[PDB]
Write a protein that binds this DNA or RNA. Structure first.
Lengths: 97, 187, 168, 106, 124, 150
RNA sequence: CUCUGAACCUGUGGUAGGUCAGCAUCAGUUUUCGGGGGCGGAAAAAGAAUAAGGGAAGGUGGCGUGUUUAUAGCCUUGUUGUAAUACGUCCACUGGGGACUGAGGACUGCGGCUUCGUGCCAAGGAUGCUGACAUAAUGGU
RNA sequence: CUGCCGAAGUUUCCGGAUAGCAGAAACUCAGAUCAGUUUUAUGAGUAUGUAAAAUGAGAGUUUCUAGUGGGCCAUUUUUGGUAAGCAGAACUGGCGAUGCGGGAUGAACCGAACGUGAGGUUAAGGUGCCGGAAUGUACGCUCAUCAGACGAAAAGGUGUUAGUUCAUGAACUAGCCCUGGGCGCUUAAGCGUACUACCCAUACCUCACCGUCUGGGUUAGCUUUGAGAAGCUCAGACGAGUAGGCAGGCGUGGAGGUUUGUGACGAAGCCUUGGGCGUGAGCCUGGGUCGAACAGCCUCUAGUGCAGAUCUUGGUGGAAGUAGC
RNA sequence: GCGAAACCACAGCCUGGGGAACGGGCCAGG
RNA sequence: UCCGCAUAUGUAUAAAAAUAGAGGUAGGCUACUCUCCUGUAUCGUAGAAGAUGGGCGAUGGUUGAUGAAACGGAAGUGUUUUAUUGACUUGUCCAUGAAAUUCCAUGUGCGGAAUCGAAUCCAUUGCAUACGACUUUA
């Protein structure tokens, strides 16, 4: 509901396997919280869950399999780099995407 | 359609009631409206018709003659001036005779729903507010009717300079091949 | 809009009248219910035939055979006014009989402040001869050289930036 | 700075009302660019907000928002009826509202 | 069956604000000419049976419990089987000694107390 | 502002409320009875769809003097089984074709409590239908009105 | 031997409660666009189109006058293979958008799928998947 | 305090007996009747009446028992009129006991009759602005310098628009203009007609909830446990209200019983922009103040509830630091 | 310096209309 | 001057003029053509809110900062001309960085003082005068 499907030429995505993207893959880590009542006081825990390396590895694999597809068709690499916005006189009910 | 913070309206050829109703609705809509050339407003009816209407008004109050004060009165009657909302809406209206220097360098729009040429039947007598005001007490008609040529001459000179400047880019447009190489998009 | 209905009606048969006469009128009404009521009212005041003893034997809407050909129609009407007795005849140039009757109703209701019930049409005919045209306005419309500019041009998006051209 | 404003400008005209009775629960909103009741069908169900600022820096911020949704068109000229989480104050007649593009069906 | 109130404002007696001698406790107007009795426009509302609240949610506090007045430890133990339906409310004239005993007992019974912090201090 | 003569007739038609509807067998005793209340009612010939959809969406039956909706065929059978009416389609058939037990089938149905028309009436509602109003007989035009009240 | 979820170590095991918000599957009510398909009418009338004749708002030729297809064509008539379309009506045909509501609280019933199913289902009234907060969120005065 | 029922406001004789309207009790009674209703045909004179068909509703009673024994708006039919208005009968309904949308505003005009709400849709009126809603579509009249929107009136119009008749004209017919809510509007934002859109009532529909009424279920009290049978449960309909009638409740002083009740670790009272409960009368509670008693439940009892009485007693204001000494 | 009393439903700018005064109190305006 | 205290979202668009039409038009007063027939246009619009670099094309468009001169009187308060000094330069081609926000929630004011002027009272005055208040002069 929070996305606009534009009519730009489609990218080749059948190559990259997407079976690893499930709801558990994106689910936030469940709360376990192994602590003692000596470091919860004084805030001596510093629990951080920065993104692991395999997530960057998956992102790199997807990027490698997608970049040639967007490079072949012209005017598309920097089109994805740009940010959509509404200017003066833009009527979304009349504009087509 | 769309609103601006300040809208300047050139009241030349606009009917008094039609323009006032549009302006009053815009004022209540939350917009600041400036009406210039208030002396060029038109009223349907002959000269003697609104003459007796204003003469009867003089018989009745603070009688105002200036054309803007006539237009300001017409707009005020179309506002809920007895409440704070109506008073606040009134303060966003600036009606003047002529086009003062802060406004002669700004774009002026017109209201097609109030234009005389699109609302009055051809061959119908009409009374200009500025002419009607001139004989009922207003005494600045001659000096403002003389200064307008000075504004028009300066503005006409500006348009010629702008048009001459535009000719260079216009020629340079078709000069550049990329204008027609990718003109298949309608531009 | 108005529709032209042809309505055929007759009185209920009895011992005195084994077989009655058929009475057919071409009358204009927005719907069939209005046409049937108008037909009975015309019969009651022309033939003194009661609706209770009468029945509608047929009703059919009629379309204009040539709606793409300009024609001149002369309409004979009866006006019921404060005096209640007037005979008038008007000529309208249009493409269908329905349009002329609608134009007549608009004209009389405007000029004469009449109503649908008061106005009754005796006859509508098609003037096929230029010599048979009586009104000067229609004769002008049949002149060989119709030549006039566009009338009543008048042409949300309030606050137009430039002055209208309102011309050629 | 023209790389923002994913929303559409709008104005809070009034509440739904008769000649002498006002109904503050539903508000009449004029979306700019929408000029008829057929174009008002695009904005139905869209989120609309009223954005204002208050003196207190509560939440460590100076801006607060009242959210709402567009329910149905109003009239023939493209005005819409909007129901907000809190009824819009009567002082906001003629104020500005933002009509997002979500929930989007485009 | 969440708690719904058909009305939250009270019903104030007509002209009770104008006159200090007139209390705000509701009194049914008896004057025939009075516009409040005739129920004109703009006038104040009157208690009607339509304003009555749902029988299932009647007498229920905003947390879904019904206030049960308690004066000693015997009253708290009564809510052993109804701790999900009733909250204990200690009376105003129960001393701070008995209030402590009531509050500890209610804690073991799993009974919510509406005014468990009154007339006492804490010391951890 | 209804005369007592018209009030009595409408009570005989079970038209106690505005926008209420009923099925009536059209005969001479009814023709001139409707003539008296013509300014206060509108009526016409229903087609199959009007009859069929009224009994489905707005169909209720008088069971023990109660307004019990016809959500199951057993409701109709338990009240009109003596007349060999066992379903809604049998009830529709009895009403549409005016069968031998039409009076019992019609009196079993509660008066149809319809809504205001979607789109309104004509500009003037209490003139006769012939004069551009909405009162009186309208023949096949009753269906187009029912599609708005359903 | 059983029991005490009994105390603590061991588990860092597994599930985790109140206000708001979002979406998806539904049910009730309702509003608003769209796609098709039957059946009616003069089995629409027109029209494209086969064609005989005629006149002029006389075209084109001929000499503004009169013409009869010329180097335009118009109307009428039967007529060329049939139609198409509009309107009316119906589909227990179908595709979207929006809003309000969620009463009830084991099981029964009427139905539809299903070879039968402690079967499944939109079938005697909402569920599922998530997100945000205690020093805040939400409401009241 | 809430709930439920609910008039009459006038025939007849004549302060009343009445009747009638509205309830209670005692009945019987659908294989029976009743009706501010329409009929069939013929009886009499389109109306009127008739016995027996359509539609709706179950009806008939007997007894006694509160309140009223006027008018107004008038419509319509209608008599006399009399400068002319107007007055006089009956009739018809409404207001009177009735709030709500509109009518610029409005006691009687147009809609519509009312439990608390959500959503939808309308009526009468409306959509230039005030003001929610088309500065919509199509066809016409008029330019009014006293437009129009709501007798000086007969006429005059070298003021017109359309048409009819006789027939170059003549008049006639009908309609607009002149002389005799605000702002504003003029191929309208006036008037007439047609057509789609749109605005919203306490009205209509769907749903939730409150209450009342009506109908049904519920015991070898079944591991569905939901038998305060005075309980539980299912369903449908309805909701103005003066006089009047009938139920159920809230509060106060005292009494019998009870809570093996509350209280100097603070009773009662009082204050409070603390919190909560009940449709309401009211009740519970936090904090503050305070200092000795007090309450819930069952029953009994009464000097038992105030805004009015040019009320009683007391206290205190504006007049006013005025008239003045 | 001393020091009242009567009176007190309540506010209080005008033009028109609100039919039963409507007015001061409503509606439309200044 | 010190002291104390409290701490809008692209804001982009300038002849006049009428419809019984205008605008401008070569040429030298024209002639005739063109344009409209609204701005649905034009100007701007990439960058982890807009990064770091390699650059390249052009060797230049935007601007910041100052030094500026002209023009603008109707209420000029702004239109340019710039001189440079620095940058982004989307003109274009590449290399890095973006994330576990892992599905929406977004100097300024007061109170004090040490100061500098001015005004009133004030020396005053009747010029004004119930009193206020006014006018002159110390």
């Amino acid at each position: 509901r929070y996305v606009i499907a534009t009519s730009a030429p489609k990218i080749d995505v059948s190559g990259v396997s997407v079976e690893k993207f499930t709801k558990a893959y994106f689910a936030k880590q469940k709360r376990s919280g192994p602590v003692k009542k000596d470091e919860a006081f004084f805030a001596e825990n510093a629990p951080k869950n920065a993104l692991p390396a395999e997530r960057i590895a998956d992102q790199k694999a997807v990027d490698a399999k997608l970049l040639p597809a967007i490079k072949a068709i012209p005017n598309m690499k920097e089109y994805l780099a740009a940010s959509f916005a509404l200017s003066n006189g833009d009527r979304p009910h009349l504009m087509k995407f | 359609s769309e609103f601006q913070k300040v809208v300047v309206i050139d009241a030349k050829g606009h009917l008094l009631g039609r323009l006032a109703s549009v302006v009053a609705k815009q004022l209540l809509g939350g917009q600041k409206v400036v009406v210039v050339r208030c002396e060029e407003l038109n009223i349907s009816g002959h000269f003697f018709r609104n003459k007796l209407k204003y003469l009867a008004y003089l018989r009745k109050a603070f009688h105002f003659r200036a054309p803007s004060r006539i237009f300001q009165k017409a707009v005020r009657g179309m506002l809920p001036h007895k409440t704070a909302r109506g008073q606040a809406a009134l303060e966003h209206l600036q009606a003047v005779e002529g086009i003062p220097p802060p406004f002669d360098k700004q774009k002026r729009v017109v209201v097609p729903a109030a234009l005389r040429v699109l609302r009055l039947k051809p061959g119908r007598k009409y009374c200009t507010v500025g002419r009607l005001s001139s004989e009922v007490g207003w005494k600045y008609n001659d000096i403002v009717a003389k200064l307008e040529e000075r504004r028009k001459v300066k503005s006409a000179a500006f348009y010629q300079a702008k048009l001459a400047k535009q000719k260079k880019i216009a020629s340079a447009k078709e000069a550049s091949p990329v204008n027609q190489k990718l003109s298949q998009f309608g531009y | 809009a108005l529709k032209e209905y042809q309505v055929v009606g007759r009185k209920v048969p009895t011992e005195h009248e084994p077989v009655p006469k058929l009475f057919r009128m071409r009358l204009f009404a927005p719907n069939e219910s209005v046409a049937k009521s108008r037909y009975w009212y015309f019969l009651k005041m022309i033939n003194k035939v009661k609706k209770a003893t009468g029945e509608i034997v047929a009703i059919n809407e009629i379309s204009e055979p040539k709606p793409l050909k300009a024609k001149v129609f002369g309409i004979w009407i009866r006006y019921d006014s404060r005096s209640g007795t007037h005979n008038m005849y008007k000529e309208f140039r249009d493409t269908t009989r329905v349009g002329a009757v609608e134009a007549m109703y608009a004209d009389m209701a405007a000029r004469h402040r009449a109503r649908f019930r008061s106005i009754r049409i005796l006859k509508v005919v098609e003037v096929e001869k230029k010599e048979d045209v009586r009104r000067n306005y229609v004769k002008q419309l049949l002149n060989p050289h119709l030549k006039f500019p566009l009338p009543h041009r008048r042409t949300k998006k309030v606050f137009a930036p430039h002055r209208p051209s309102t011309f050629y | 700075a023209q790389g923002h404003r994913l929303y559409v400008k709008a104005k809070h005209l009034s509440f739904q009302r008769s000649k002498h009775v006002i109904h503050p629960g539903t508000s009449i909103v004029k979306i700019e660019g929408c000029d008829s009741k057929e174009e008002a069908q695009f904005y139905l169900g869209k989120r609309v907000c009223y954005v204002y600022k208050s003196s207190k820096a509560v939440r460590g911020s100076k801006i607060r928002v009242i959210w709402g949704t567009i329910a149905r068109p109003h009239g023939n000229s493209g005005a819409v009826r909007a129901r907000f989480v809190h009824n819009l104050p009567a002082k906001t007649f003629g104020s500005s509202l933002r009509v997002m593009l979500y929930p989007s069906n485009i | 069956v969440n708690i719904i109130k058909k009305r939250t404002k009270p019903f104030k007696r007509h002209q009770s604000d104008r006159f200090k001698r007139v209390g705000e406790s509701w009194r049914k107007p008896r004057g025939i000419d009075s516009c409040v009795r005739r129920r004109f426009r703009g006038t104040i509302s009157m208690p009607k049976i339509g304003y009555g609240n749902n029988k299932k949610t009647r007498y229920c506090m905003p947390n879904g419990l019904k206030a049960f007045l308690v004066r000693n430890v015997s009253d708290v133990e009564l809510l052993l089987m109804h701790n999900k339906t009733y909250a204990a409310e200690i009376a105003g004239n129960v001393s701070a000694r008995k209030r402590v005993e009531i509050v500890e007992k209610a804690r073991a019974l799993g009974v919510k107390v509406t005014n468990a912090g009154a007339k006492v201090r804490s010391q951890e | 502002n209804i005369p007592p003569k018209a009030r009595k007739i409408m009570q005989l038609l079970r038209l106690l409320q505005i926008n209420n509807g009923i099925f009536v067998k059209f005969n001479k005793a009814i023709k001139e009875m409707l003539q008296v209340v013509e300014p206060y009612v509108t009526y016409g010939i229903p087609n199959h769809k009007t009859v069929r959809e009224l009994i489905y969406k707005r169909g209720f039956g008088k069971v023990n003097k109660q307004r019990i909706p016809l959500s199951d065929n057993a409701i109709i059978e338990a009240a009109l089984g003596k007349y060999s009416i066992l379903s809604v389609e049998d009830l529709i058939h009895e009403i549409y074709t005016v069968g031998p037990n039409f009076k019992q089938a019609a009196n079993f149905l509660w008066p149809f409590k319809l809504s205001s028309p979607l789109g309104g009436w004509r500009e003037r509602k209490f003139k006769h239908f012939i004069e551009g109003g909405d009162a009186g007989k309208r023949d096949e035009h009753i269906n187009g009105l029912v599609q708005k009240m359903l």
